[PDB]
């Protein structure tokens, strides 16, 4: 909802930013996010 999904080279940081994420996206801390479960969790077509 305001997010693009391109096959970017994603820099691999080491932060613990998984903690309280699936509950934080449900309440709406993030203004715009895309949840990709299953086949959508892919480095998309160029």
């Amino acid at each position: 909802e305001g997010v693009e999904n391109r096959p970017f080279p994603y820099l691999t940081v080491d932060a613990d930013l998984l903690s309280n994420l699936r509950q934080s996206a449900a309440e709406g801390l993030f203004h715009s996010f895309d949840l990709l479960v299953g086949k959508d969790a892919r480095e998309a077509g160029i």
Binding site: D16, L18, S19, N20, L21, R22, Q23
Partner: protein, 81 residues
């Protein structure tokens, strides 16, 4: 062999380890099986009648009615708040 990250405490003669897998389950957003539920049953009566040889054990409280004939009809309990 390799170092294992585990805080070891000494309880008498045994040196046990203390490991928390809370970080392992918070990266799943899955509940940690050590935050369990505990349901105890609470029971309380309401409307009982104390037998007619009657007594008090407190010289502080003074109700304004007849002490011989008084019946509980409700039971004031407390919440969690």
């Amino acid at each position: 062999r390799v170092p294992i990250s585990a805080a070891v405490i000494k309880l008498g003669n045994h040196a046990v380890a203390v490991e928390s897998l809370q970080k392992m389950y918070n990266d799943t957003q899955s509940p940690y099986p050590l935050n369990r539920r505990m349901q105890y049953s609470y029971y309380f009566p309401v409307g009982l009648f104390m037998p007619n040889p009657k007594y008090t054990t407190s010289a502080a409280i003074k109700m304004l009615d007849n002490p011989t004939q008084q019946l509980p009809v409700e039971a004031w309990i407390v919440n969690k708040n």
